[PDB]
Design a protein around this nucleic acid. Structure first.
Lengths: 38, 141, 286, 176
RNA sequence: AGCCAGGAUGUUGGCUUAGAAGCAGCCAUCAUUUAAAGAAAGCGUAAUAGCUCACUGGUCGAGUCGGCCUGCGCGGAAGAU
């Protein structure tokens, strides 16, 4: 999980759910599109 | 006719026996002997002077079967068969070269009227005027 | 002796990819780790191997009880393989004359001169499991230089008359030149094989395809590595036709006034080209 | 809501034991009980079960929205069951069932044989296909996902242990 | 929002045709049928077969959706007996 202050909804099918409070964004086929902070 | 299994209309000029690589996949969909589609159409291909893309459609069946529908060549290539060059659309609304009147357009529409139930005479007349303006062609009668 | 090593899969994979007709003979006993027996099906005997020794036992027993039915359904396909090899075994597959170990190989050996079936054997080289088994088929399923069509020297240019010469010692001499290695002792060496005839030591052996004269020096045999001087070369040995002045790929090694062979079929093409450059300017001289 | 427009119909062959907050479902082949939270108002009304969110816990529309989906699965899981098949694609990798134990031919220097708990009747038609049967929807995944986590789907070959319906995304080497 | 569900089909959409064949990119950017379809968004990809968006055409049978303004909240937030 890459970390950066900006979670920008980037991939076309990008889920966003708030697990534990810190946002981590869920793609389907792209592992590269998953950030976690912010 | 059929449904979500397979329906693509793709065939180009039938002087070439071997399926051209981009056409290949529409024959590479439901397991054909590619010699069968070469031996089906050549009984009637000897009634033409080859050079224009003639279209067929493919449609499939359960076990190993298939079917296909023969029509006439479309008027879009018939616009640029008489006009000499096969590709004229470089600038649509800035080129004024080449005239054919409506009388040529209906006699290449009777061969549509004797083949197909859509692509009717009077409705296609503006689109056979519409494929003229995109190519940069003129029309007067 | 590995995981995923199914014997019956691979021999029945040849009929799908290679499209051939293999009928295997020596089958498998053991779940690849407690593997102890190789199932020869003609004599219907399993062979015990070494506990872990580099080669003690050869103990033959019967078919074990854990494979009493797979030996049944596979032996009946072995004895099929002579009824459709020769036409004469067709009427005793169905009539029920006994298909012994010795009778079936007399048809199948003639099925190696046309090569429609290959003979397969499972086992281990490194675990010493099968190597002592694999040798007896070579004298009975691989062909001999006197059982094959022998040296067939055609002519030169006059007429196409292919002539089967004799495989015995009663012919003009004949050999071929291949695997022509080098050495810093004598220079050029060969790994040549003589098909029939006997040569003495010291001969005016020519190379009759390229019109050159050579003389036959001190011939040396190997254990693939060690110099052993073979003086008298008998018909069928493989040795080193030493001292050839010029020699090409596959020309004859033959006395004059004799038949002459001339063949260089399928001359290859080395494709990838890299340019070597010297280090010093004294190096490019060498 | 959609969940409030979703009542569940218990059929004959599965008995409920409504001691208020604790429901123990007496079913076909097991006992699928869940001790829910106090954000629910449960009533097996006539035959079709009706539920309700308790006051104070107005977020119990979520907490019983779990429950409406929950007990529907329980009455159909204790009777019919789940086929949870896994596909073993591994070089020399086998699967064989004995009692309640599964072998794991997993490319190691030692065998892994792990015993599997109750609510599991496992089977193996071959070395690469493995049945799991169960009554709870949780237990039919939890014992399945542990095996898959021992050898995840490798996206350079397609290697690994993977589900029947799961479709991996294998890549290409592209350098050497 | 999901299961059935056609992805109605003129066309090869040129150019330059080697494939730039709706899916590389610049100019057109009409539509034969319009209760469902654009000379077009990505993946499959040299091109396409596979899979969709397009209208949800038929079922559920009620609410639902994208942004503007504020009350506060979370992440951003790592230091040295």
């Amino acid at each position: 999980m890459k970390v950066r202050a900006s979670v920008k909804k980037l991939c076309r099918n990008c889920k966003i759910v708030k697990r534990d409070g810190v946002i981590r964004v869920i793609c389907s086929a792209e592992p590269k599109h998953k950030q976690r902070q912010g | 006719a059929k449904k979500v299994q397979a329906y693509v209309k793709l065939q180009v000029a039938a002087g070439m026996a071997n399926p051209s690589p981009p056409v290949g996949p529409a024959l590479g969909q439901q397991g054909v002997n590619i010699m069968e589609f070469c031996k089906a159409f050549n009984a009637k291909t000897d009634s033409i002077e080859k050079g224009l893309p003639i279209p067929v459609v493919i449609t499939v069946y359960a076990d190993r079967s298939f079917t296909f529908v023969t029509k006439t060549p479309p008027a879009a290539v018939l616009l640029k068969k008489a006009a000499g060059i096969k590709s004229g659309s470089g600038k649509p609304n800035k080129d004024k070269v080449g005239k054919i009147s409506r009388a040529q357009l209906q006699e290449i529409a009777q061969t549509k009227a004797a083949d197909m139930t859509g692509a009717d005479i009077e409705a296609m007349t503006r689109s056979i005027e519409g494929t003229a303006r995109s190519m940069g062609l003129v029309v007067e009668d | 002796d590995r995981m995923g090593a199914n014997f019956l899969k691979v021999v029945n994979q040849i009929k799908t990819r290679l499209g051939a007709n293999p009928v295997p003979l020596q089958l498998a006993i053991g779940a690849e780790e407690h593997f102890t027996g190789v199932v020869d099906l003609v004599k219907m005997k399993a062979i015990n191997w070494n506990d872990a020794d580099q080669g003690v036992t050869f103990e033959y027993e019967d078919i074990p009880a854990d494979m009493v039915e797979l030996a049944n359904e596979w032996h009946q396909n072995l004895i099929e393989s002579a009824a459709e090899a020769s036409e004469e075994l067709m009427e005793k597959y169905l009539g029920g004359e006994e298909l012994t170990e010795a009778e079936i190989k007399g048809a199948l050996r003639q099925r190696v001169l046309n090569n429609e079936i290959i003979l397969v054997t499972c086992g281990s080289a490194f675990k010493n499991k099968g190597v002592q088994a694999m040798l007896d088929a070579v004298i009975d399923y691989l062909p001999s230089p006197v059982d094959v069509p022998a040296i067939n020297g055609i002519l030169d240019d006059g007429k196409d008359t292919p002539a089967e010469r004799h495989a015995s010692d009663d012919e003009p001499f004949s050999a071929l030149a291949f695997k022509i290695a080098t050495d810093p002792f004598v220079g050029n060496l060969t790994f040549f094989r003589v098909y029939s005839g006997v040569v003495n030591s010291g001969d005016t052996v020519l190379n009759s395809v390229k019109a050159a004269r050579e003389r036959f020096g001190r011939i040396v045999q190997m254990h693939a590595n060690k110099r052993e001087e073979i003086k008298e070369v008998r018909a069928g040995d493989i040795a080193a036709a030493i001292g050839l002045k010029d020699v090409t790929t596959g020309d004859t090694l033959c006395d004059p006034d004799a038949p002459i062979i001339l063949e260089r079929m399928e001359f290859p093409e080395p494709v990838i080209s890299i340019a070597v450059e010297p280090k010093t300017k004294a190096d490019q001289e060498k | 809501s959609r969940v409030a427009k979703a009542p569940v119909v218990v059929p004959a062959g599965v008995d409920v034991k409504i001691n208020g907050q604790v429901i123990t479902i007496k079913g076909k082949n097991g006992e699928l009980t869940r001790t829910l939270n106090d954000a629910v108002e449960v009533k097996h009304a006539d035959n079709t079960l009706t539920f309700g969110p308790r006051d104070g816990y107005a977020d119990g529309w979520a907490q019983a929205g779990t429950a409406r989906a929950l007990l529907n699965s329980m009455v159909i899981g204790v009777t019919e069951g789940f086929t949870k098949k896994l596909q073993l694609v591994g070089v020399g990798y086998r699967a064989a069932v004995k009692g309640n134990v599964i072998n794991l031919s997993l490319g190691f220097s030692h065998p892994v044989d792990h015993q599997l708990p109750a609510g599991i009747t496992a089977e193996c038609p071959t070395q690469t296909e493995i049945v799991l049967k169960g009554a709870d929807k949780q237990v039919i995944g939890q014992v399945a996902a542990d095996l898959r986590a021992y050898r995840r789907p490798e996206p350079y070959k397609g290697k690994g242990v993977r589900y029947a319906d799961e479709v991996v995304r294998t890549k290409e080497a592209k350098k050497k």
